[PDB]
A paper describes a structure:
The eIF4F complex includes a core of eIF4E, eIF4G and eIF4A5,6. eIF4E recognises and binds the mRNA 5’cap, and recruits eIF4G to provide a scaffold function for the eIF4F complex, while eIF4A is an RNA helicase that is stimulated by binding to eIF4E and eIF4G8. Here we screen a fragment library against eIF4E and identify a ligand-binding site with previously unknown function.
When compound 4 was profiled against the major variant of eIF4E (D127), the protein ligand crystal structure showed a similar binding mode for both variants. A small change in flexible loop conformation (around L85) was observed for the major D127 variant compared to the minor N127 which may in part explain the 5-fold reduction in binding affinity (Kd = 0.09 µM; LE 0.38). Comparison of the compound 4-eIF4E structure with that of an eIF4G peptide51 bound to eIF4E suggested that this conformational change would potentially impact on binding of eIF4G due to steric clashes between residues H78-N84 from eIF4E with residues D638-L641 from the eIF4G peptide. Consistent with this mode of competitive binding, incubation of cell lysates with a peptide (RIIY; RIIYDRKFLMECRNSPV)56 derived from 4E-BP1 inhibited binding of both eIF4G and 4E-BP1 to eIF4E. This contrasted with compound 4 treatment, which did not disrupt 4E-BP1 binding to eIF4E even when eIF4G binding was lost.
Residue numbers in the entry:
A (entry chain A), B (entry chain B): 10 to 206, 211 to 217
Write the structure that this text describes.
């Protein structure tokens, strides 16, 4: 049918009042299937054994079941990365869907770990699963949270750094959904530029 | 050793670049040996003369040799059934390994005979031979394709309809590997229920 779009209030209502959809034995299907990955760079193990597929889901209710479980069981320590990517896109630059891409980046201060990290990450996840960028949601690959002593980072990765209209729409809506004051500028950088380098390619 | 698991890309690469394994004079052995059966209900012959063992194989390269041959020489007409089952499991409910079982069913409409039947059947076969359900692949008995004017059907048969964790894992991974949109619900039904009866026992 048409793209399955859910707004923030609808998704939030499914957490405590989910499972009452009119089909799918009550589950609300998502537009896309998503995979959650965990990474921690531990030099004692291989890179392969450091990247872990945690879980895949494709309904609102299964997203919340995973969210609730992670909220109870998972490591929030420096050096952890968590990534939510569309099924079939590995959470790495070399994936065919990421090689030409880039990311909208949010950088937090340490004071913002207690005030803002959880709420900004949740808002990011809802933008993803809810297809909040209308047709330009198709350019979204995934999102990454890096937990770091120097300051945590959240990013939305998109497929094509030269798709100006898609990339800028995603950034504007993401900023709006995060609720950031206008004066707090966020930037988009291609993955190629992040490999070796406010002055970003696009700013909103 | 450990379970022999092959992903889709590896299996696909063996079709045109097969026979270069480091042992077995180049063949890649499968975890299981498999038997391909054909059935057509023809009232002029007995039931036993209507069920035919076509061939058995136990390597990736011999799977592709059979695939290529069937693709050239075999009947695709309404009333045909083809079944790929682990060696020693007959493709019938009464087999000891199927009596307590059930199936994940995919039902096609006629527009999907040309767009989807071959690709969905191939993806099913790759899930089977590649042991794509990890430890729960041991609950897989086989798969069946029914060619019908009213709409073709593909199913994965499993051994125990009350093994909830195994059955549900198989269904989720099968749906993921078929690439079905989240909103396209597939259902599991016990063979006992198929004998006399969206509302299925498990849905994913
Ligand atoms: C492990 C805690 C981690 O914390 C972040 C850094 C801030 O929140 C984290 C990771 C992934 C998910 C997640 C869950 C379901 C689907 C997709 C996901 F990415 C949720 C959480 N944390 C929830 C509690 O805040
Ligand atoms: C008409 C041939 C039939 O078509 C199906 C319905 C759709 O594709 C069919 C049956 C069995 C196999 C098969 C081959 C090797 C191992 C196991 C198998 F089940 C392959 C094909 N078709 C290949 C594409 O022509």
């Amino acid at each position: 049918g048409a793209r399955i779009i859910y707004d923030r209030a609808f998704l939030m209502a499914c957490r405590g009042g989910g499972g009452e959809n009119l089909y799918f034995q009550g589950k609300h299907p998502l537009q896309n299937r998503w995979a959650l990955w965990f990474f921690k760079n531990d030099k004692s193990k291989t890179w392969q054994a450091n990247l872990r597929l945690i879980s895949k889901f494709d309904t609102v209710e299964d997203f919340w079941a995973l969210y609730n479980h992670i909220q109870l069981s998972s490591n929030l320590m420096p050096g952890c990365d968590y990534s939510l990517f569309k099924d079939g896109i590995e959470p790495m630059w070399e994936d065919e869907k990421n090689k030409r891409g880039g990311r909208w980046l949010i950088t937090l201060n340490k004071q913002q770990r207690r005030s803002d990290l959880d709420r900004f990450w949740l808002e990011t996840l809802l933008c993803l699963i809810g297809e909040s960028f209308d047709d330009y949601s198709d350019d979204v690959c995934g999102a990454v949270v890096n937990v770091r002593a120097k300051g945590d980072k959240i990013a939305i990765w998109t497929t094509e750094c030269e798709n100006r209209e898609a990339v800028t729409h995603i950034g504007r809506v993401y900023k709006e959904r995060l609720g950031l004051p206008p004066k707090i500028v966020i930037g988009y950088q291609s993955h190629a530029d992040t490999a070796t380098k406010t002055k970003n390619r696009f700013v909103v």
